[PDB]
Amino acid sequence: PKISYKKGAASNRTKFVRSLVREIAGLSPYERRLIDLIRNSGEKRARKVAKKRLGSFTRAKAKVEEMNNIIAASRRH
Amino acid sequence: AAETFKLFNKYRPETAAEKKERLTKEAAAVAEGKSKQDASPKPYAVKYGLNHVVALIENKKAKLVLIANDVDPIELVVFLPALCKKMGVPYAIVKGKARLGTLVNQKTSAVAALTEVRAEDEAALAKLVSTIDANFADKYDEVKKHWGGGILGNKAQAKMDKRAKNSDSA
Amino acid sequence: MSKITSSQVREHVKELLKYSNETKKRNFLETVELQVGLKNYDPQRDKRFSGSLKLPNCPRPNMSICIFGDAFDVDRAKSCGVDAMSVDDLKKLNKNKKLIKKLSKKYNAFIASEVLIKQVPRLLGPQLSKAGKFPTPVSHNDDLYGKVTDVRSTIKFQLKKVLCLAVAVGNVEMEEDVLVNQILMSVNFFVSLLKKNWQNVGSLVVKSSMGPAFRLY
Amino acid sequence: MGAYKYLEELQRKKQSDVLRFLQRVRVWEYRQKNVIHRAARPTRPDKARRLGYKAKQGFVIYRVRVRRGNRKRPVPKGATYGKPTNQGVNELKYQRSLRATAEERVGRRAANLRVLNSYWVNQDSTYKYFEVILVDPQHKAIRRDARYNWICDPVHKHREARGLTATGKKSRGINKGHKFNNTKAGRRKTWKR
RNA sequence: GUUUGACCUCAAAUCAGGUAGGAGUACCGCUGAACUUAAGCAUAUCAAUAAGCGGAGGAAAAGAAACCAACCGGGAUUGCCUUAGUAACGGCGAGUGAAGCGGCAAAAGCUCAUCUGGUACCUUCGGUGCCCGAGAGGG
RNA sequence: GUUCUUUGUAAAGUGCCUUCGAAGAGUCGAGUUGUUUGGGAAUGCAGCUCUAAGUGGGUGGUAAAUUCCAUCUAAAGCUAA
RNA sequence: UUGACAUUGUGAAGAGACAUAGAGGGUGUAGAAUAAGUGGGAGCUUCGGCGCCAGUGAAAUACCACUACCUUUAUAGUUUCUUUACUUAUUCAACGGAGCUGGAAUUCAUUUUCCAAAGGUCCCAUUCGGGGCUGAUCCGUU
């Protein structure tokens, strides 16, 4: 988890930006769910694995609700 | 009980509530605002209800909000603690839903409530914002390492029986 | 010290990180002028055609001096003397065979290439041997010496599948430097076989001699 | 959007945690309580409002519980009596949804009312929970408001049996357009052409 | 440690007010056969038929596009017409079997996300008098 | 055809300026099991399991990069003839 | 009948791996040995070491990245499987701890177990009559 590294919040932001890129790519051949696995699996597998594992489970939770609403808003404006 | 992934807990001895509760009744009661005009300056605005409260925080008008601890379903109040911190708007958490409704001078209970614009009480209000950070200055490491429970008498004794166990028996 | 200036996680654009450009001028610690070099991880295959080999002409030199020996026959020897250090006949192969190897690289004629063949055991190991693949034999020999002295640079894929060449000196200006990496990448990116799979430029890195490296997108 | 969007968001989720605690605890209450549970409040305000839920007289929110699984058909022990294509106990499934059965049950008990509405809200394992809006036609409050006024007219009575509800339309396969669709204008409407 | 008055959640009663259950021939939503056909038969067919059940109205049901499309244009939804025994299904056997369009009947676009009850007053589908509970922006 | 009578305010057209939400999640989509259909990797619906984004998204008769084309905003509702 | 998935939580580790950081070694012909396979490359530091030079060969052996593979460490992980422990969701069936004082035992001691409506007061009355509390017990459906 804490740190990584290097960088921090900027790295957290990359991990989350990367996960969106994997998830859209994962949508775009449908499934998603097995494909979320296959898209990660057909890739290096380290940083990516940890992000995916959370993404499936719990899945940040409160923080997604937070971030999404700020994004919704700032596409609202 | 529960399991649980973290919800909500913390601070409200009655003293810290009581000052905030009298300052909310005076937040409404202070009303003039006032018989002539078109434009015409306030004293008071109080708005009750979860929807009004959330909007006024996003508008950044609200000076200080109250949330009730006792809210069920839980998911109504959930947005505001995080949201208001983002905005830098202070919040108090009163123990009961009913209490919050009476002071806002509603007929019924209030889930949340706000003071939007106070009246001449700069120092005491600031003094309560500070008292409110004095009780939960916190940032968010939210919080359950799992809690839930309080153990039960037979399990609690088992805890004792296990401590003896480490000391000579296991 | 040098490590702190670089960011491993960051992948910079050609101008921002030196690569060939500004920041690595700071990076190259050494007393002598270092060469800056370019490194690729290329997805490419064991097959010969899928290898990456050709020669780019750097707009602005490597700024190293390279002494040629070039062996030619007829009006081509005459032509040689114009832009060449040591004009050589077909006779001269016996001298290099005995011991003399005072030359960086060698360029030869098509005519010469019969005679050349004897030279290859000695040459082939250092990879000095002339080959069409690294354009060292052509009957337009005069133009081609001009290119190698200007600073045409050689590119060879490894068995390892990394591809490498020196781009310039660190000391040369940032603006100058950027042009050379660009030509080199452009030349790489074209040479790339169709037969190669997804992303021909897998990774791109430049370093100096001594220093840490920064990656380019 | 404004309050609701958060609540609505939490719903999208549901393995996932702030909703997930609420609901896990609510499962306990759900198992104890009857097939009929009338409730003052939408555990759903977000979904309910778009639902045309407005607080106003005659309106109720009600929670209904329907079993989960396939279909079981009578008459076991005395198995038919037909060729193998006919044959099916468990093989066959309801065509109608579990949501739709829940609406018909709710409306059956509350004869007085007509269902506007069905929203799904907890999955446990054995049970499926649907929270149903039923609307009083008969009184003047619902009537005086133009937005609601439609429910009242005599044609709408027993809309849930008739399949007129949003779910009922959906289970006809109706939506809404062309090829997919053609024999959804009605089932009987093709009329053995 | 201990109670009392009050806040809201669940429950039960009660009388009031309001409505439903049932019915009329068929029309009009689900679950769901068989003989029969293929000269047998098991997919297929009969058939999404009949039946059973639920339930509404004077018509019902469907409705203004997350449509059509194979172009460049159309522009809500039924029905009629014909598309067509075409596409498609299928022991690719027997059989099964459309749609878009074209144009007709007829046309229509909108709408969501102070209210009620009590008593009084009248010219009683109303409103007044009170009390009670609960597509958007600037000048 | 005749007759009574309240103020208005805000809506709306035309034209200038930025701009933009009231737009609906166990849904969209997937597998594995059905039944239905003309629906064929490509009808519609049920069930179990799993599960998005938020101006992003869906469609365009198998599935996968791109610019873009061409069209439309589900998970809501009403409605005469 | 039998395995898997949902129901769905807790964490002990035994065993398997995957971040970086610090180690070591890197089994093709000849070659003392350490030429695995890549950019580079004339030095980095000085009492020095390696290049220098030996010597062979296709290519030689400073030094700052790199990185296949054998192995092994730290920071603070995380991951499957078990099992194997543990209860809080859950299912099915239909009391717990303290308090006296009694008795048994330990420990010099601290310490640690085993067991099992009357009359009083108050409040009306102040008058009969009544009520509250106490009446061995304090705390927190199986």
From Swiss-Prot, chain A:
Keyword Chloroplast assigned to the entry: answer is no
Taken from the UniProt entry, a GO cellular component term is: cytosol
Principal subcellular localisation of the protein: cytoplasm
* Biological process, per Gene Ontology: cytoplasmic translation
Q: Which GO terms describe its molecular function?
A: RNA binding; structural constituent of ribosome
Q: Does the keyword Cell cycle apply?
A: no
Question: What keyword terms does UniProt attach to this protein?
Answer: Acetylation, Cytoplasm, Ribonucleoprotein, Ribosomal protein
Where does it live in the cell?
A: Cytoplasm
Reported modifications of this chain: N-terminally acetylated by acetyltransferase NatA.
- Please give the subunit comment from the record: Component of the large ribosomal subunit (LSU). Mature yeast ribosomes consist of a small (40S) and a large (60S) subunit. The 40S small subunit contains 1 molecule of ribosomal RNA (18S rRNA) and 33 different proteins (encoded by 57 genes). The large 60S subunit contains 3 rRNA molecules (25S, 5.8S and 5S rRNA) and 46 different proteins (encoded by 81 genes).
Q: Which family does it belong to?
A: Belongs to the eukaryotic ribosomal protein eL36 family.
Q: What does this protein do?
A: Component of the ribosome, a large ribonucleoprotein complex responsible for the synthesis of proteins in the cell. The small ribosomal subunit (SSU) binds messenger RNAs (mRNAs) and translates the encoded message by selecting cognate aminoacyl-transfer RNA (tRNA) molecules. The large subunit (LSU) contains the ribosomal catalytic site termed the peptidyl transferase center (PTC), which catalyzes the formation of peptide bonds, thereby polymerizing the amino acids delivered by tRNAs into a polypeptide chain.
Relay the record's extra comment.
Answer: Present with 31600 molecules/cell in log phase SD medium.
Q: Under which name does UniProt file this protein?
A: Large ribosomal subunit protein eL36A
Coding gene? RPL36A
From Swiss-Prot, chain B:
Q: Which UniProt keywords apply?
A: Cytoplasm, Ribonucleoprotein, Ribosomal protein
Question: Where in the cell is the protein located?
Answer: Cytoplasm
Mind naming one GO cellular-component term on file for this protein? cytosolic large ribosomal subunit
Q: What GO MF terms are annotated?
A: RNA binding; structural constituent of ribosome
Tell me if Isomerase is a UniProt keyword of this record. no
Q: Which family does it belong to?
A: Belongs to the eukaryotic ribosomal protein eL8 family.
**Oligomeric and partner information:** Component of the large ribosomal subunit (LSU). Mature yeast ribosomes consist of a small (40S) and a large (60S) subunit. The 40S small subunit contains 1 molecule of ribosomal RNA (18S rRNA) and 33 different proteins (encoded by 57 genes). The large 60S subunit contains 3 rRNA molecules (25S, 5.8S and 5S rRNA) and 46 different proteins (encoded by 81 genes).
| Remarks, miscellaneous | Present with 238000 molecules/cell in log phase SD medium. There are 2 genes for eL8 in yeast.
Described purpose of this protein according to its UniProt entry = Component of the ribosome, a large ribonucleoprotein complex responsible for the synthesis of proteins in the cell. The small ribosomal subunit (SSU) binds messenger RNAs (mRNAs) and translates the encoded message by selecting cognate aminoacyl-transfer RNA (tRNA) molecules. The large subunit (LSU) contains the ribosomal catalytic site termed the peptidyl transferase center (PTC), which catalyzes the formation of peptide bonds, thereby polymerizing the amino acids delivered by tRNAs into a polypeptide chain.
Name this protein carries in UniProt: Large ribosomal subunit protein eL8A
Q: Which gene encodes it?
A: RPL8A
Query: Which residues of the whole protein does the chain here span?
Result: 87 to 256 of 256
Swiss-Prot record, chain C:
Tell me the residues on which N-acetylserine occurs.
Answer: 2
Positions carrying N6-methyllysine are 47
Name its cellular compartments: Cytoplasm
Q: Tell me, in one coarse class, where this protein mainly resides.
A: cytoplasm
Q: Which InterPro entries match?
A: eL8/uL1-like, Ribosomal_uL1, Ribosomal_uL1-like, Ribosomal_uL1/biogenesis, Ribosomal_uL1_3-a/b-sand, Ribosomal_uL1_CS
MF term (GO), any: structural constituent of ribosome
What is the role of this chain?
Component of the ribosome, a large ribonucleoprotein complex responsible for the synthesis of proteins in the cell. The small ribosomal subunit (SSU) binds messenger RNAs (mRNAs) and translates the encoded message by selecting cognate aminoacyl-transfer RNA (tRNA) molecules. The large subunit (LSU) contains the ribosomal catalytic site termed the peptidyl transferase center (PTC), which catalyzes the formation of peptide bonds, thereby polymerizing the amino acids delivered by tRNAs into a polypeptide chain.
Instruction: Identify its protein family.
Output: Belongs to the universal ribosomal protein uL1 family.
Protein name, UniProt field: Large ribosomal subunit protein uL1A
Query: What is the native source organism of this protein?
Result: Saccharomyces cerevisiae (strain ATCC 204508 / S288c) (Baker's yeast)
- Provide the organism lineage as a comma list: Eukaryota, Fungi, Dikarya, Ascomycota, Saccharomycotina
Gene designation: RPL1A
From Swiss-Prot, chain D:
- Which GO biological-process labels does this protein carry? cytoplasmic translation
> What's the further remark here?
There are 2 genes for eL15 in yeast.
Main subcellular localization, coarse class?
cytoplasm
Q: What does this protein do?
A: Component of the ribosome, a large ribonucleoprotein complex responsible for the synthesis of proteins in the cell. The small ribosomal subunit (SSU) binds messenger RNAs (mRNAs) and translates the encoded message by selecting cognate aminoacyl-transfer RNA (tRNA) molecules. The large subunit (LSU) contains the ribosomal catalytic site termed the peptidyl transferase center (PTC), which catalyzes the formation of peptide bonds, thereby polymerizing the amino acids delivered by tRNAs into a polypeptide chain.
Give me the Gene Ontology terms describing cellular component: cytosol; cytosolic large ribosomal subunit
Looking up PANTHER family in the UniProt record yields:
LARGE RIBOSOMAL SUBUNIT PROTEIN EL15, RIBOSOMAL PROTEIN L15
Q: Which family does it belong to?
A: Belongs to the eukaryotic ribosomal protein eL15 family.
Q: What taxonomic ancestry is recorded?
A: Eukaryota, Fungi, Dikarya, Ascomycota, Saccharomycotina
Q: List the disulfide bonds.
A: none
Q: How does it assemble?
A: Component of the large ribosomal subunit (LSU). Mature yeast ribosomes consist of a small (40S) and a large (60S) subunit. The 40S small subunit contains 1 molecule of ribosomal RNA (18S rRNA) and 33 different proteins (encoded by 57 genes). The large 60S subunit contains 3 rRNA molecules (25S, 5.8S and 5S rRNA) and 46 different proteins (encoded by 81 genes).
Keywords, sorted A to Z = Cytoplasm, Ribonucleoprotein, Ribosomal protein
Transmembrane region positions?
Answer: none
- Can you provide one Gene Ontology molecular function annotated for this UniProt record? structural constituent of ribosome
